[PDB]
Design a protein around this nucleic acid. Sequence first.
RNA 1: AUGCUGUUGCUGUUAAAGGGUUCGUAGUUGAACUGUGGGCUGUUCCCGUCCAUUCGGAUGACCCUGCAGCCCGUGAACAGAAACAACGGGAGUGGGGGCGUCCGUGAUUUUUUACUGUGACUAAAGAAGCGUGACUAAAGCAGUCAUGACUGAAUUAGAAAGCAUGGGAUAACAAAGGAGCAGUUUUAAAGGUCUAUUGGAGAUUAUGGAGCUGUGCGACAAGUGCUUUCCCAUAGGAAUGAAGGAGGGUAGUCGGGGGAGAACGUACUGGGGCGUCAGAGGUGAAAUUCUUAGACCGCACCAAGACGAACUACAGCGAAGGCAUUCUUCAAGGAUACCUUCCUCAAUCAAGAACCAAAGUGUGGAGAUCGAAGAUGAUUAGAGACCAUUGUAGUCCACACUGCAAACGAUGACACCCAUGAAUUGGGGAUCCUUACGUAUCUUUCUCAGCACGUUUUCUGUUUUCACGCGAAAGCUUUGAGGUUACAGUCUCAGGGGGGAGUAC
RNA 2: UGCCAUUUGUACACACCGCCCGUCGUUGUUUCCGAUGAUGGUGCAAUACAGGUGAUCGGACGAAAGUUCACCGAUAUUUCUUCAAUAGAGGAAGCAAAAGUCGUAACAAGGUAGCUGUAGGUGAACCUGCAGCUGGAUCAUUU
RNA 3: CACCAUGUUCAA
Lengths: 73, 142, 142, 129
Amino acid sequence: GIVHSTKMHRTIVIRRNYLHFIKKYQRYQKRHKSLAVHCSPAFDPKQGDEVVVGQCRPLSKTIRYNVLEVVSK
Amino acid sequence: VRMHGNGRGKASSALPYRRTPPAWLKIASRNVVKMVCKSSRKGMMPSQIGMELRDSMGIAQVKNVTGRKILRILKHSGLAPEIPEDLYFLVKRATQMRKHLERHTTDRDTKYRLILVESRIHRLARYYKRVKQLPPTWKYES
Amino acid sequence: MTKTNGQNAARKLVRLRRRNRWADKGWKRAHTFAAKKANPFGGSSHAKGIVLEKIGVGAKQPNSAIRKCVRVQLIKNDKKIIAFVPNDGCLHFIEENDEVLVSGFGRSGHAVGDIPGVRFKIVKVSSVGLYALYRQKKEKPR
Amino acid sequence: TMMSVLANALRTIASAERRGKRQVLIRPSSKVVVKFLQVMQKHGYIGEFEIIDDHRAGKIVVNLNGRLNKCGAICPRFDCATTDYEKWMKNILPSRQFGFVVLTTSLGIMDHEEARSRNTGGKVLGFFY
RNA sequence: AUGCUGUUGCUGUUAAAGGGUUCGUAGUUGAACUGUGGGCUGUUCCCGUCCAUUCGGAUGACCCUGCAGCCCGUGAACAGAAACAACGGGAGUGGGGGCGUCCGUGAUUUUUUACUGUGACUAAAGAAGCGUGACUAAAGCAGUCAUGACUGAAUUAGAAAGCAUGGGAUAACAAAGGAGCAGUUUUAAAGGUCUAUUGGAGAUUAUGGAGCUGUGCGACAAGUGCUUUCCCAUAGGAAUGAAGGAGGGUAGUCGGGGGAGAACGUACUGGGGCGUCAGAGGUGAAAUUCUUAGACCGCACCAAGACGAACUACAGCGAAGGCAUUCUUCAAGGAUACCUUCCUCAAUCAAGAACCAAAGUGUGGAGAUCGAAGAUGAUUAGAGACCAUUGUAGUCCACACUGCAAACGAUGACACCCAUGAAUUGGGGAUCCUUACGUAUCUUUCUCAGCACGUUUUCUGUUUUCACGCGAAAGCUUUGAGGUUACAGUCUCAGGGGGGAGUAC
RNA sequence: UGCCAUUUGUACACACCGCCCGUCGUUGUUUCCGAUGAUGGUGCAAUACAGGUGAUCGGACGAAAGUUCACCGAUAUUUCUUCAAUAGAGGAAGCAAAAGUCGUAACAAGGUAGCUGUAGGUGAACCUGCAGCUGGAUCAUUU
RNA sequence: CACCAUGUUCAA
Ligand SMILES: *O[C@H]1[C@H](O)[C@@H](N)[C@@H](O[C@H]2[C@H](O[C@@H]3O[C@H](CO)[C@@H](O[C@H]4O[C@@H](CN)[C@@H](O)[C@H](O)[C@H]4N)[C@H]3O)[C@@H](O)[C@H](N)C[C@@H]2N)O[C@@H]1CO
Ligand SMILES: NC[C@@H]1O[C@H](O[C@H]2[C@@H](O)[C@H](O[C@@H]3[C@@H](O)[C@H](N)C[C@H](N)[C@H]3O[C@H]3O[C@H](CO)[C@@H](O)[C@H](O)[C@H]3N)O[C@@H]2CO)[C@H](N)[C@@H](O)[C@@H]1O
Ligand SMILES: NC[C@@H]1O[C@H](O[C@H]2[C@@H](O)[C@H](O[C@@H]3[C@@H](O)[C@H](N)C[C@H](N)[C@H]3O[C@H]3O[C@H](CO)[C@@H](O)[C@H](O)[C@H]3N)O[C@@H]2CO)[C@H](N)[C@@H](O)[C@@H]1O
Ligand SMILES: NC[C@@H]1O[C@H](O[C@H]2[C@@H](O)[C@H](O[C@@H]3[C@@H](O)[C@H](N)C[C@H](N)[C@H]3O[C@H]3O[C@H](CO)[C@@H](O)[C@H](O)[C@H]3N)O[C@@H]2CO)[C@H](N)[C@@H](O)[C@@H]1O
Ligand SMILES: [Mg+2]
Ligand SMILES: [Mg+2]
Ligand SMILES: [Mg+2]
Ligand SMILES: [Mg+2]
Ligand SMILES: [Mg+2]
Ligand SMILES: [Mg+2]
Ligand SMILES: [Mg+2]
Ligand SMILES: [Mg+2]
């Protein structure tokens, strides 16, 4: 995903942007999913940084993923 | 001016195919950089430097004589304007319209044309902030 | 001047079509609930009712007759309607306070040609069929 | 403004060919619009064409030989699988005998007949017949 | 059935339908460029020397994709440069150097996504169908054959997402905005930093490997000449290009474009000043109305408020409403010219903004003329109308509000291609498919090296009678309603039989 | 008064003795407004609170009855919100029906050209003022 | 440019 907001303490919200194909109108459609991802203090990702997240257990009400690598800018 | 208004006017300068100085001019590439950087110390903006070299020195297209462009020569020397030349003359136009409109409260046409120049200002300043020629906090006057 | 291409323009085309299907009087009647809540039959067919009174409805121009029809009050929702009695005779088979089985006739509730403002039809009176009484297949109870 | 340069070029070829001209002047040009024309040369629908060099985008002068009926561009460039060639032939081509659908594939810009033989798929660019 | 829901695939000048005009976000769409290589071998005329005089003659042309090996741009070699992209607790008891694998671990500088080809996984019943005379068939999975035999129940499509892998055209995400920038090896020397062996293990201990930085020195490069460049007698030149896309600049400008000041012009009224005398007015005919306390008329003038005749047109300006005397001013606008600058900044638009005729509204002015309402005449069967005489609100200005037009071209915006002949407005320039060519008129002591014209080019604008093509037709036609069943350049708004009804909430 | 031809306009077509508009009467229908009347559910949160669960005591005969507290919470009642239905004096709009009344607005220069916007007037079609439009009854007259 | 309003219902 790409980092959307880092305003929470030690947790980021990533944004996963994808094109949804409609079988009727032979055309794609921009959709997105946002995920709250726990971010370790090993990492400091800014907004727009591309991260790799790995699924883990529930860590809060919404956190299922956990950042593994940050690709800067 | 096509962007605001109905004008389909096509009046431009058509640059030559043969991008080479004409061999009758013996001025060095080193001296043209001195003349370009000198005119900027007399307060001339890059569009005005090039006409003075075009008209009087015989240097059509400073890029062909010295391999880099006029504003690039100025940025290297530290003599670039603070805000770009496009944005300068649109702001300088927009303040001269507003100083008119403060005493002429019902100039209905110039209030319309002032919307159009400020729409050009907010649309260029979005370009220059994106391309980082302008600081992110820039924010035109009115 | 009509529609949009673009490989990523499907949300525009999906929204554009879902609003223009409401202009279709078949799509709008099949997808709004004023269709059944105002239909005197409860979105169904052949509703029963009780004969209240006999009416002679005069035919529209250029025809000239009076059409023999009863006004019945339905049992499932207590809605008063006027319904036509088809054949030569056949108000002689209907008396007041008779239960009658009333269908529409023809055109999905749009008043088959000559008769003004009547869009239903008697099928069966006193739980014996009304066309069977006409052809004398069988006769009325009691 | 001009959006598709290939759709511009094929529209000026097809217009000047129904007028029965001997040459067209195509402006602007691309790498795509010359690779489309070289498909139209190989199956002899156009003649020799010439790319004039500006230091701008070029211009192309195409010699027409009367054989082209219609060339057009499919916009947007729909993705076409290998199972989908017989669907695109029935839609935009007049017959299965003649006529070509040009596709941009990984292997290059090819017509539909070559791309069926090399077992590839692509995005559809245009057609000529 | 219904291309009557249109992605394929609909309509929108007049049949229902382009929204009054601009700006404008979300949205959708978006110009070109960095390249796909090469070698060998196959596979009769016409042009001249004699005749003839507004018409003849004997006398140099042409004709004979296919397989292999490439430092795979050119440099540079004859393994080095170019371009590239250590664990035995490992392997069915470890397959004296080289070669090359396998497995797992460390150190070294980075490219994805859509698309597309193959796979891997994916319950029957249902669909497709392979066998088979349940008597046929709908079925079903069975059965078929001469102390048991060959057994059958084959196979295929099944949405998207998920998994693996290779192809690199088209597109996409991201970053950059280019002064904001990323010298390689031999050699010996100085200083200085926190594991493996000596039989093991523990504790001390100097030497050394490889790395750390400040040097001198030996080779070779360098995409920008330092045997230079400035001074005077010190990295600064290596960057795609400049879109018949946008922006900005400079230049004479052009126009009923807009704002602000003054000043003119007749006219409609109303006044007095001069004179006149018997009716003026108005109409299809009249009558309301004015008039011997002098109407109408005539002359000069004054006042006030509107309005700028003719010139004034298939003319100009403006985004649309709209704009018509003059002179002094204020800020602008487009076009044109350009070898100026910039370098993708754009197109179109829900939401949101600012304008928007006339009538209307509020508060102040103004109040000449025309004049909804109203009043009188008349016409009429009636006249609440047309016609005549009046007359309130209004008309006009300032500042607010409204936002309702046949706001029209009943035609959305931006690009593209598109035959012909008169004109017109502003700017500029000349006087076997050809290697080029034509210039008059008249005004001219100062907004005057001037003004207008003539012939010809060319850009921008408003159009006209004229080739395709199109349309149900009327008609449209580089100004599309053309380039459309041979149907896809981009975006956007509206329509879906007539009503009810632009009504009710 | 009629007829014939040409031009032009037309909503006429058994064709101007044509067609056609609104008010008003009669009958029937479906909506809407309306003092007032009233129904079924939701949600909101307020108390009261059946039961139980856990704890604390209890300890008749280890362990029943019973205390007390916390928690889950049905139900009851009230407060507004919200959805769906419903009665109503009276006041309207619309539509539909063989030949009732009043005019004549539109179609022709429909006899005052029509029509758009707006404002005011009228039994009723409608008239009137102002600015637009031609879909006009003119593609046209200081060259 | 005085006034000049209207002709029941189907059908042929
Ligand atoms: O921009 C012009 C274009 O480049 C060019 N194709 C031209 O087309 C015609 C040309 O038509 C116009 O005739 C007009 C004269 O009646 C003339 O206008 C010109 O008039 C001159 C005198 N005033 C000039 O001074 C003026 O600037 C200019 N506007 C032409 O424009 C014909 O004359 C030719 N015979 C044929 C060309 N095809 O028209 C474009 C603008 O209309
Ligand atoms: N307007 C009323 C019309 O009546 C129809 O109603 C029904 C009938 O009128 C109609 O019956 C038709 C019959 O009229 C016509 N003459 C022949 C046709 N085969 C029949 O059809 C019927 O009978 C066959 C048997 O062969 C059945 O197989 C078939 O499914 C059935 N539709 O088929 C319909 C099925 O009962 C439509 N349901 C209705 O939508 C439509 O509006
Ligand atoms: N429930 C409200 C009622 O509405 C009534 O009002 C009725 C009338 O005022 C009103 O009049 C309608 C009218 O809308 C429409 N424009 C014309 C229609 N003919 C009339 O209809 C009425 O009048 C006629 C008599 O001529 C009757 O035959 C008819 O049944 C009756 N509904 O329609 C209403 C009923 O449809 C009464 N005021 C009263 O009973 C009560 O208020
Ligand atoms: N029906 C709703 C409306 O009624 C109005 O008009 C209605 C009435 O005013 C009109 O009345 C007409 C009248 O024009 C004409 N002068 C005389 C004629 N007899 C009347 O007719 C009416 O009444 C009789 C019974 O009396 C009915 O048989 C007849 O069907 C009906 N039209 O008939 C119409 C009824 O259909 C509107 N003009 C119209 O817009 C609309 O149709
Ligand atoms: Mg190893
Ligand atoms: Mg440019
Ligand atoms: Mg006077
Ligand atoms: Mg006087
Ligand atoms: Mg009269
Ligand atoms: Mg008057
Ligand atoms: Mg008549
Ligand atoms: Mg009458």
